[PDB]
Symmetry: C5
Subunit: 231 residues, 5 copies
């Protein structure tokens, strides 16, 4: 009931001691309980990934407790302060890096101008576009990010067919988005023609800035809309 909180977070593990006591590690402190039903409750919570809150006056490793709060506290991964202070993960392929960097710089500059520094952008590098969905899924499952942006330049090199990889990447990004319930913005673009001539390079080098600005606006709007409909 009424007792100051000591630890709050997902159960790392549930241990059984020699004295028929249930030792459960919550947060940075290990605590043990002597209630037999609490053993099954903590085991089920750990199995189902349900967080518990243990409040006791002995906030130390190995301390005893008898009152457990099973109310929602995050159930594991989770982060975020206020509503306009969050983080965004930017994943960029390293093929045609001089063009993707334009979009990245435009995105970062526009976010800084709009939010005034309340939104933080983290940059991650991958070899190619095929590596983006798995990296996005790995980053999304840790919480810590309100949105994820993937940037790549997939072109037809004139030797091998390129549509298979682009289709797979787009489908995988959509699948990760639906799986993790975390928005994923797509800046993976496939031009109709790119013959690596001087004229082609300048055009897309200039256009990726506009693409980055559009992506920044879209990310801000979608995060705000999700926050609003989340009541």
């Amino acid at each position: 009931m009424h007792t100051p909180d000591c630890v709050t977070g997902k159960v790392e593990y549930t241990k059984y001691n020699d004295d028929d006591t249930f030792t459960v590690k919550v947060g940075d402190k290990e605590l043990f309980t002597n209630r037999w039903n609490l053993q099954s409750l903590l085991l089920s919570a750990q199995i189902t990934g349900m967080t518990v809150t243990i409040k006791t006056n002995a906030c130390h490793n190995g301390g005893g407790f008898s009152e457990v709060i099973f109310r929602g506290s995050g159930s594991g991964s989770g982060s975020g302060s206020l509503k306009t202070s969050f983080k965004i993960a930017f994943i960029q392929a390293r093929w045609h890096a001089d063009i993707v960097d334009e979009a990245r710089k435009s995105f970062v500059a526009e976010l800084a101008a709009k939010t005034g520094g309340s939104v933080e952008v983290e940059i991650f590098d991958v070899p190619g576009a095929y590596e983006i969905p798995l990296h996005a899924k790995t980053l999304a499952r840790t919480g810590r990010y309100a949105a994820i942006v993937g940037a790549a330049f997939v072109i037809d090199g004139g030797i091998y067919r390129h549509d298979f990889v682009a289709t797979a990447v787009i489908n995988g990004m959509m699948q990760v988005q639906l799986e993790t319930e975390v928005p994923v913005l797509s800046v993976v673009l496939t031009p109709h023609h790119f013959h690596e001539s001087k004229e082609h390079h300048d055009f897309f080098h200039a256009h990726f800035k506009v693409k980055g600005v559009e992506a920044a606006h879209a990310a801000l709007q979608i995060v705000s809309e999700r926050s609003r409909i989340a009541a």
Copy 2:
């Protein structure tokens, strides 16, 4: 058994007290029970998302009870009154908004004319068509909606290939439809040619009204058919 109902709804959490009593939060009131088997029953119901109905004369927080109704009551999310009074969620992209707004207005006007105000339409904005499947999935899991409509105008801009995004959006909408068992109507249209000329603008501006009317009729018919086959 025979006892006036106090609370009815999904179990928010199941708490263990110091006196070996099981505190379960159902509805807006917290109640506790002293039956050891009821502890396991409530834990399993919460784990499997099975709703319970607790009836007692002490309809207040912390009250005691011994009789629990495990009959179906919604199992969490759920809404809807009668059969012709429901709600529809309309999701519209903001690219080429002047054309999509025609379909939205036609849809709303036709629904108002047909149902006479019994059906309510709620409008949600997303940056682009790529953001529609996740928004639809998020809205579907809350109940509260008998159908979901997604409207977008995906065109070929003459610079980048556009079929990947359209394919991903259609496939994702179908996947969400199959996952959540909630109908999703598609007003995501891809014209053969759109060169942003004056002639092209007027034609589709006019055609989206017909598209919206067709979507309204389809939504009404599909909701009625699902209600009928649900016995």
Copy 3:
């Protein structure tokens, strides 16, 4: 052990009474038991969707029992008598209804001629082809049907691209078929050219009869083959 059966079917709900007794609703009658281990057994069976059979002399609501048959009895949904007497669900879109009706009539007539009335066909209407996979999934999960047939006419109208919807519908029908282990026959056809001229109308109006006869033969053959390999 040896006791005449009273109720056989899936457990609707498991109720705990004030006298530490487990009340379980099987079939149309509610019964209660006083075995503590039977409480956990029935709870697990309801959680895992495992049917139980309760045989007792008190075949009435609220009666007591002690012997439970946990042998396979259907595990919920299930229907079917003999091997040549089953039911088929026919789902038809309402776009170009005058052509789809030809296939439906041919299918019904051929089934009546072949089986002699042992096979029953039920007709369900949907607005368009996009609504077919969800309706098929909903109908398949109730048992009651040995096969499902979906009929639609998806054409290129000359304004919007149509391949996305056709691909989504075919993939969704395949996914539902693999998910529910119920055969789904496809009569969703996309012609190379259809310009709504008089010549085009008559040709497909005539061809859909042959398509329906072929679908009827295929459905009969596949149902017989599945029955045979099911040992």
Copy 4:
């Protein structure tokens, strides 16, 4: 422990008797135990599909036991003797049967010549290529087969588009392969042109023999490789 084995196999069902004893059906014999913890153990094993081995001197229905081996024994479905003596399931569509039969005969003859009769081939008929993935999935879950081969001839008839069905069939075969962990060989072929002329018929009639020989070699190689990497 040390006791001669009586029955070994998956638990068909777990029954509770009137004398607080747990009756479990393993293999062709029904046996009961009086250990309360064994009741929960057997219930969990049946729920999770974990096989148990019951050894007792009373190898008869209704006999008692107290020692249970929970070591891996198959967990349900499973078959196979030695490493070069297995079975293969051949699924053939009945469209253009005169061409598919060439591949089937070539496959069977090559397998007989190579293995000398150690490998057995079973033939299953389906109406069309659309029926292959579900049949393959149904056959795979029974064990009893080290590989599955699907043969069909999908052509463009000049009236309706055919790529949707071929794409769905190939994707479904891959999905079943990944789901059931059973190799599925593809002999579903789509020619560039087939106008049902005399010249076209002979060419593919001759080529399907080579296709069948290639499929036989591939099946043998893949089964051997999986056996090798399975340690």
Copy 5:
């Protein structure tokens, strides 16, 4: 608590003895415990695939124990020493083997030159590209590999359409990647034109070396990046 470790690993099976004792096989030694709650704990850990560590002075089969470590130890499959010493699995199809061998040799030579022998490459053979996703899924689930590379040469033979198989293979590789959380590099290439002439053979024979070097660099970079973001 404080006791030297004896066995650490996933629970192979949980056995119940005649003396109401729970025998659990961890690692290469079998041990039994007399704690009733430990029986349920070990059963749940085996069901959920949660590893346990048993530390006792009787490090032998059939020994007794009372203290169990439930802390994370691998939960089953898992391998890897340091951060620059890992293993890579190379899967190569046997169609056009003389071209794929160039990529394999280039990959191995570049890895040996870069890592100096700290990274080990294992080569697995499959009949065709269609067999790659299942082999990759089987190899990934055993741990033991930080990345998987699939190499194949899918060409248009001029008789049958080839895009279905390539699309299925790429999609399946992406699906396995997302399922198993193990990176999968794609060296499955489809040229625009390959007419088996002398000129075509030499060009791709030379280009596959560059492809292999690129794949080696990409694999090293992605493994390092995943290790870095794993904190």
